[PDB]
């Protein structure tokens, strides 16, 4: 009988899309960004060189493609969005009211991130005459865009461009000037690969570049030109055409970039420059992660970033209609990005795929560069490629940095510093850019301490308050391994006599992995490290490096009734873990003594076990350890850890365990929760409850002795509860789900706590896209009925910005149950005054009363 109210305290900070334009309609260039289910408008100030957030809107959907377009003779850029509805939307930002005005919303399919229903891909004619929304398979739709007598945008009926058994890697509109608009697609047919049982067709089928031409005269779309590719490419770039450029497309692939154009244009290929003395795996390829174009009335250039984070500048050499060669020049090195934007007034906005985002000022475009520029004209054989050495940035200067908590991998709320109010300790970031951050509030303030690898879990020492963090990353080198790899490279490269001095210069060159990426290599290599960190000072009190293929996944600090009140730290570690397909050698449990007031790890022993220990949980002088699908009780021996009790009937794989009294709550990777009883008298573990639904539970929190709240891999929250006075000696007990909700972001940490002292007790969660949310219980049913009415009214009168149905959205994988969306309720203050008055009098009060009610429920926490 619990009813919750959901509120976002810190919205998502991880950017998935970013596009720049003249959305204000003035000189100013703004950037709209899609972070998860949020659409934001930002204005970079050219004077101070710092980015400001002008607008934030919760759209209650899944933005899959974001694009900007403009019509001929226009002054403002529109925003076309494809989402998880069956709808394409076109919006215009009105600066007079600081809002996103929905200009058009056209329906074509069903909701969800479906396979054959368009929404994933968006392309637009470079002149703004048409726009194609495309699914990954089969169906594509083209809409014709025009204006009317009052200069109001108008959209036509859709035109079908379907082709069965056809995948889509990417699609972009080709600059054909003012001819019939054309869209270039990267496709691949699977019809032959499916009907052949040997595998000849699957290996022989190849990606194709096709051109859909929109005949405006006859008003239809035709599959005109299609050509295979000897190299499989990942995305396309439109090169300018018509008057100020040669029409065509650039195709980025693995280890190459190609230029192609329909007609008698020879394909111009060029290999991608690889790094000088790269520590990566030699048999691992290289692709581009994102692109960006900038047009002048004199020239135009492209910017492309590699997996390594190296940004190259690309230019095309012009001989009238045809192009002669592709030229490339190493520009700089920034963290790997999902989107880049080259504004005017010399500013580059980089939206990192993880971690903080940045804005730089362009000092020099690298034209008067002494560094070598490469070209397709330079000849070579045997497939050997062009080389270059990365260098600290000088073409760009860091003018602004935007904090991004994405991706949050672990969180703990506690008052470690005696501030009398708790703080949020968040293990987030990724790779060398990982960080442990302390958040306060009085939006949050944050302080960040860098980390080596991606943090997985961390526990708190009760007496010392320090944190025991474990950081693990896949296909990465350990410190000793990268040192010995550097040594082997230097010793192998001198055989061919200045190579000695060159090797000295190479070894003395330790580029920060924080900027130039971590030298990552292998299929099943695992870099893992344990560290002990003070929560107030960023200093680390001790660090333990592990073997080259040992990957930590679980940590816990506790005492043992076997020994005295001295502490201990257990770490579970997989050995030789392969992710796809999954295969592992086994697991180890490291036992450290943790001496010197929680500042020094003292190794004791190292116990082998059948599979990876995924969860460690203290349990009344013993510990509870999950090894694969086995649940075990371990006591501390003097030469190893000795099993005392085991259960082998868990469904698939234990990911976490929490204990209340003698009840054990086991999280399965797929089959939801399982309630197990430990009978102390007989020393046996008995399964006595499970769930009626499957859940890919990521984290969980104990509400009471009968109730458990959990989070899903698919961005869901649920609350399940056992029937009253369930007996643990009778089995076949099923739990009923008393709460279901879809956050829209994948939650990885749930914790029941009170953020302000003495106030309300609530349920705080953290999402993988850097979001902080809260669920609060309702004091009285009066308020509950009020907010239910508010929710239904806002659903009917303020529908989600991208055509999604709010009720259907919050019921993505299960029908919503006993949650009120406060993020939707608080959009009451952004409606039109007449709608506010109407829905207020329907609530039998004034708009200020409704506002005050929302404000007090938010301050209550």
């Amino acid at each position: 009988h619990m009813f919750l109210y959901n509120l976002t305290l810190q919205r998502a900070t991880g950017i998935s899309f970013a596009i720049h334009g003249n959305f204000s309609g003035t000189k100013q260039q703004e950037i709209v960004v899609s972070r998860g289910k949020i659409l934001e408008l930002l204005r970079p100030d050219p004077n101070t060189g710092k980015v400001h957030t002008l607008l934030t809107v919760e759209v209650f959907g899944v933005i899959r493609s974001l694009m900007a377009f403009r019509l001929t003779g226009g002054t403002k850029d529109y925003i076309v969005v494809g989402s998880d509805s069956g709808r394409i939307v076109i919006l215009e930002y009105q600066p007079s009211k600081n809002m996103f005005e929905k200009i058009h919303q056209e329906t074509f399919g069903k909701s969800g991130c479906r396979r054959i229903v368009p929404g994933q891909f968006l392309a637009v004619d470079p002149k703004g005459r048409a726009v194609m929304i495309s699914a990954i398979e089969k169906q594509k739709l083209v809409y014709i865009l025009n204006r009317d007598a009052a200069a109001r945008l108008t959209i036509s009926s859709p035109l079908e461009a379907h082709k069965a058994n056809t995948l889509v890697y990417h699609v972009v509109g080709v600059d054909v000037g003012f001819e019939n608009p054309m869209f270039a697609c990267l496709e691949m047919d699977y019809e032959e690969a499916d009907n052949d049982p040997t595998g000849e067709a699957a290996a022989n089928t190849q990606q194709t570049l096709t051109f859909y031409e929109l005949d405006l005269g006859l008003n239809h779309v035709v599959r005109k030109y299609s050509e295979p590719l000897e190299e499989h490419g990942n995305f396309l770039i439109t090169v300018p055409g018509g008057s100020d450029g040669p029409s065509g497309v650039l195709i980025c692939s693995e280890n190459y970039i190609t230029y192609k154009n329909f007609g008698d244009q020879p394909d111009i290929r060029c290999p991608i420059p690889r790094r000088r003395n790269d520590l990566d795996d030699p048999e691992r390829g290289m692709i581009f992660v994102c692109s960006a174009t900038h047009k002048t009335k004199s020239m135009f250039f492209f910017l492309a970033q590699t997996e390594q984070g190296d940004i190259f500048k690309i230019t095309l050499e012009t001989d009238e209609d045809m192009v002669t060669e592709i030229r490339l020049k190493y520009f700089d090195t920034v963290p790997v990005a999902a989107a880049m934007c080259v504004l005017k007034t010399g500013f580059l906005f980089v939206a990192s795929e993880f971690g903080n985002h940045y804005l730089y000022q362009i000092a020099h475009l690298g034209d008067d560069d002494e560094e070598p520029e490469f070209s397709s004209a330079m000849p070579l054989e045997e497939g050997d490629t062009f080389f270059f050495q990365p260098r600290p940035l000088k073409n760009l200067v860091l003018v602004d940095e935007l904090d991004s908590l994405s991706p949050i991998l672990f969180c703990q709320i506690a008052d470690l510093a005696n501030e009398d109010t708790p703080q949020l300790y968040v293990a987030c970031g990724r790779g060398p850019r990982s960080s442990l951050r302390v958040l306060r509030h009085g939006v949050f303030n944050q302080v960040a301490f860098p980390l080596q690898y991606t943090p997985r879990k961390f526990v708190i020492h009760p007496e010392s308050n320090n944190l025991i963090i474990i950081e693990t990353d896949h296909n990465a080198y350990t410190e000793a391994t990268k040192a010995q790899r550097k040594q082997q490279m230097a010793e192998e490269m001198v055989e061919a006599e200045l190579a000695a001095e060159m090797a000295a210069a190479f070894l003395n060159e330790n580029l920060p992995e924080s900027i130039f990426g971590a030298p990552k290599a292998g299929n099943g290599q695992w870099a893992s490290v344990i560290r002990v960190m003070n929560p107030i000072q960023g200093n680390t009190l001790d660090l333990v490096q592990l073997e080259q293929n040992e990957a930590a996944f679980s940590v816990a600090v506790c005492r043992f009734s076997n020994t005295g009140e001295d502490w201990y730290v257990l770490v579970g570690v997989a050995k030789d873990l392969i992710l796809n397909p999954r295969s592992v050698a086994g697991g180890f449990v490291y036992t450290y003594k943790l001496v010197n007031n929680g500042e020094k790890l003292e190794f004791l022993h190292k116990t082998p076990v059948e599979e990876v220990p995924a969860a460690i949980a203290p349990f009344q002088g013993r510990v509870l350890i999950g090894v694969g699908k086995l649940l075990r009780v371990y006591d501390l021996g003097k030469k190893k850890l000795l099993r005392k009790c085991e259960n082998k009937h868990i469904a698939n794989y234990i990911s976490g365990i929490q204990t209340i009294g003698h009840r054990v709550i086991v999280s399965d990777v797929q089959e939801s929760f399982i309630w197990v009883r430990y009978k102390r008298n007989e020393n046996q573990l008995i399964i006595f409850a499970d769930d009626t639904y499957p859940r890919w539970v990521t984290t969980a929190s104990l509400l009471d002795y009968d109730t458990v709240a959990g989070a899903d891999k698919f961005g869901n929250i649920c609350v399940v509860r056992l029937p009253p006075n369930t007996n643990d000696e009778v089995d076949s007990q099923k739990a009923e789900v008393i709460m279901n909700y879809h956050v829209g972001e994948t939650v990885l940490s749930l914790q029941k706590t009170t953020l302000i002292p003495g106030g309300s007790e609530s349920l705080v969660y953290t999402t993988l896209s850097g979001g902080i949310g809260i669920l609060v219980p309702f004091t009285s049913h009066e308020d509950h009925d009020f907010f239910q009415h508010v929710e239904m009214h806002l659903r009917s009168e303020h529908p989600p910005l991208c055509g999604r149905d709010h009720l259907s959205f919050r019921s993505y994988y299960f029908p919503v149950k006993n949650v009120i969306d406060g993020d939707l309720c608080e959009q009451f203050n952004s409606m039109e005054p007449n709608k506010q008055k109407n829905v207020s009098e329907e609530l039998d009060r004034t708009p200020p009363e409704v506002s005050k009610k929302l404000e007090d429920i938010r301050t209550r926490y």
Binding site: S16, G36, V62, R64, D84, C113, R114, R115, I116, G119, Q120, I136, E137, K138, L167, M188, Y190, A193, D194, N195, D196, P197, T198, G199, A202, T205, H232, N234, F235, E254, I287, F288, V289, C290, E307, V336, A338, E353, F354, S406, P407, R430, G431, T454, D473, H474, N475, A476, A518, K520, L579, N580, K713, F714, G715, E745, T746, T767, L768, S769
Partner: protein, 66 residues
């Protein structure tokens, strides 16, 4: 019916059903941002790289038929 991929009949083989749901899963990974983020954190690869890998695996996700 016949127009919608992924539907089945009384003669649908196990292979057809499973490759259909595997392709559905890969497209849903491409769609949901945080799911792809989880995958790109588990394997230490960029989002573009895992998207390329998924599109590559779209061809024969489960293997050739009988």
């Amino acid at each position: 019916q016949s127009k919608y991929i992924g539907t089945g009949h009384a003669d649908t083989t196990k292979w057809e059903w499973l490759v259909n749901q595997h392709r559905d899963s890969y497209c849903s990974y491409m769609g949901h941002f945080d799911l792809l983020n989880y995958f790109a954190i588990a394997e230490n690869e960029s989002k573009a790289r895992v998207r390329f890998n998924l599109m590559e695996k779209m061809l024969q996700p489960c293997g050739p038929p009988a």
